[PDB]
Amino acid sequence: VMTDPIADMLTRIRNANMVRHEKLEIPASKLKREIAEILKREGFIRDVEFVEDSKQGIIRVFLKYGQNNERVITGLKRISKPGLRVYAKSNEVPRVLNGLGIAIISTSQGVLTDKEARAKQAGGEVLAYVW
Amino acid sequence: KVCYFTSNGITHIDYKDVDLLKKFVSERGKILPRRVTGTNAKYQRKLTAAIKRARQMALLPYVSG
Amino acid sequence: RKYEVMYIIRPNIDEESKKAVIERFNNVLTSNGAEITGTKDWGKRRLAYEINDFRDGFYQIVNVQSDAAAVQEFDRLAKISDDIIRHIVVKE
Amino acid sequence: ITQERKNQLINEFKTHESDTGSPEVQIAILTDSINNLNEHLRTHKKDHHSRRGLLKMVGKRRNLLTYLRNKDVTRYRELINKLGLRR
RNA sequence: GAACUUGAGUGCAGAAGAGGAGAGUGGAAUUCCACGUGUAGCGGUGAAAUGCGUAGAGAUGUGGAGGAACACCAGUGGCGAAGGCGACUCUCUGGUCUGUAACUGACGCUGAGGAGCGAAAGCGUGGGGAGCGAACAGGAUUAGAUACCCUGGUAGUCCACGCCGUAAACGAUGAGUGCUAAGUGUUAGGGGGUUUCCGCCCCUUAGUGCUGCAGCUAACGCAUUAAGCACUCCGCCUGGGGAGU
């Protein structure tokens, strides 16, 4: 059965990205929606729509490709998993691809990027890497 | 070829209907294969049961001679 | 439930004996809480092959509605009798 | 399990007029199937394939009983009395 | 703690199936027994012989006995968790699939240890025994032939109960879930499109095959039935022998 919705959402993006799809639709949740919003703010995806319905909602994500159809998102990794959680100290918050990518940490301040969390001297669960 | 039963709207094949059944057995009494008679898969199975019931009740022969 | 009992009476009997047989076995079915919906009689047909050295027989076709118990009792008696040479119970 | 027996069970155990999904209802249906199937296996001891069906039923019943007990202990206790279960 | 319905399950309406257990019934064929007709070989091999036959064989006709297996249908067809399941009828009985949104509202996944099942051979008790046939005997072959080949043939194969618990038990591929081009057969459904229909065409589920992108692989190949991309749980591997000792 479904065990890691966050991982599953990342995989939908990875798979859709791999075949240069324009858009994908992810079943929504509060945490998945926050991750999607970071990707837009950080310029990894084009746009994100939240469609309501009777069920839990759908996130339509529009992927972003440069000139020459180049994929902006090169890779996505799930770090914290249901089987092995990963929490980081404020000073041990990882940089991703030597600062060319981002890491998404869930903190008590909110769901931030690595840079944002570092400025607040906050740690927390390291959700994913994106580069 | 087309299935005789779907064409004529035959829902229930019956082992009693010997005259109909006899169109599906060979000269020797062998049940003709579906590939040769064009019957639908579903109706071939129903038809096979009918012939076996008929052969049991002496309406059709097992071996013609 | 609806069953269709067909059976074959040996062809070497007179009409008096035949009617006796039919009444006897129809009574068995009804006796065990059945109800005879239909009763066709195909009459003497040529058997496809010899049964007990008989090339012909009288084909009866009794439709009934009954439980297991009723149809099973026909089977037992139909086998024992020497007049009925073959039978088949069939759910409809 | 005949249809009229099933209607008896569901009406007797349902938590409300339209209720057919409640743990109570499901456990009642299963309990009869389990008892009914046990009787069949007493004569046809060697019907291993059918028996496997019983084992899934037994597991389903235990899971529904476990769910009920954890959701609301009261409701759980009432049901096992009416059904005569040892759980 | 309170809600929600997608997961899971229940209800309701349909569908297919060698799924299982029990009890019956049927036709072909082999063997044996009796009888009629009938005479000198039959059988077997690469070639022969052993063997059977004038005591009447083999061939042929009628009837009967008994045991085992179910031609045609039959199909990378169906069903089952796997082993496996194929004549017909009835009794009992498990599971799966499709639609529905009437109901419960996360009740789910995996699962060490444990329990149950598990081809064939084999074992115990008692039946049964046609065909087949380890062992064994004889005839050949051969340098030898404790084999291949031939003629016989015991256990066994079959049944009831119990035991055994192993297979190249294989897709050499653990279970669950989701995501990621297409084309093309085929099985069981649903909906629709011109219709009495037939049918053709379109769509949709769930299986079962082939081809084939992306991706993966040492290569061969896999490829919506993944060996791709992911997450959960379990099992297992760490050079070859020694040794599955």
Curated annotation (Swiss-Prot), chain A:
GO biological process: translation
Keyword Cell inner membrane tagged: no
Claim: Transcription is one of the keywords in the record: no
InterPro entries associated with the record: Ribosomal_uS8, Ribosomal_uS8_CS, Ribosomal_uS8_sf
GO MF entries: rRNA binding; structural constituent of ribosome
HAMAP family: Ribosomal_uS8_B (MF_01302_B)
Oligomer and partners: Part of the 30S ribosomal subunit. Contacts proteins S5 and S12.
Annotated protein name in UniProt: Small ribosomal subunit protein uS8
Curated annotation (Swiss-Prot), chain B:
Domain of life: Bacteria
Keywords: Ribonucleoprotein, Ribosomal protein, RNA-binding, rRNA-binding
Protein's UniProt keywords contain Transferase: no
Induction and repression of expression: Strongly expressed during exponential growth, decreases 2-4-fold in stationary phase, part of the rpsF-ssbA-rpsR operon. The operon is induced by DNA damage by mitomycin C.
A GO BP entry: translation
GO MF, one annotated term: small ribosomal subunit rRNA binding
Assembly description: Part of the 30S ribosomal subunit. Forms a tight heterodimer with protein bS6.
Protein name according to UniProt: Small ribosomal subunit protein bS18
Chain's gene name: rpsR
Boundaries of the shown chain within the full protein: 14 to 78 of 79
From Swiss-Prot, chain C:
InterPro entries linked: Ribosomal_bS6 (IPR000529), Ribosomal_bS6_CS (IPR020815), Ribosomal_bS6_sf (IPR035980), Ribosomal_S6_plastid/chlpt (IPR020814), Transl_elong_EF1B/ribsomal_bS6 (IPR014717)
Domain of life, per lineage: Bacteria
Disulfide bonds: none
Keywords: Ribonucleoprotein, Ribosomal protein, RNA-binding, rRNA-binding
Keyword rRNA-binding: yes
PROSITE patterns attached to this UniProt entry: RIBOSOMAL_S6
Inducing stimuli: Strongly expressed during exponential growth, decreases 2-4-fold in stationary phase, part of the rpsF-ssbA-rpsR operon. The operon is induced by DNA damage by mitomycin C.
Pfam families: Ribosomal_S6
A GO term, aspect molecular function: small ribosomal subunit rRNA binding
Listed GO CC annotations: cytoplasm; ribonucleoprotein complex; ribosome
KW Transcription regulation (keyword) present: no
Biological processes annotated in GO: translation
Assembly and oligomerization: Part of the 30S ribosomal subunit.
Function: Binds together with bS18 to 16S ribosomal RNA.
Family from the record: Belongs to the bacterial ribosomal protein bS6 family.
Name of the protein in its database record: Small ribosomal subunit protein bS6
Swiss-Prot record, chain D:
CDD domains associated with the record: Ribosomal_S15p_S13e (cd00353)
A cellular component annotation (GO) from this entry: cytosolic small ribosomal subunit
Keyword Signal (UniProt): no
Alphabetized UniProt keyword annotations: Ribonucleoprotein, Ribosomal protein, RNA-binding, rRNA-binding
Domain of life: Bacteria
A single BP term in Gene Ontology: translation
Sample GO molecular function, one term: rRNA binding
Region of interest: Disordered: 1-22
Compositional bias (Basic and acidic residues): 1-19
Described function: One of the primary rRNA binding proteins, it binds directly to 16S rRNA where it helps nucleate assembly of the platform of the 30S subunit by binding and bridging several RNA helices of the 16S rRNA.
Family named by the database record: Belongs to the universal ribosomal protein uS15 family.
Subunit structure: Part of the 30S ribosomal subunit. Forms a bridge to the 50S subunit in the 70S ribosome, contacting the 23S rRNA.
Name recorded for this polypeptide: Small ribosomal subunit protein uS15
Organism, as annotated: Bacillus subtilis (strain 168)
Species lineage: Bacteria, Bacillati, Bacillota, Bacilli, Bacillales
Gene name of this polypeptide: rpsO
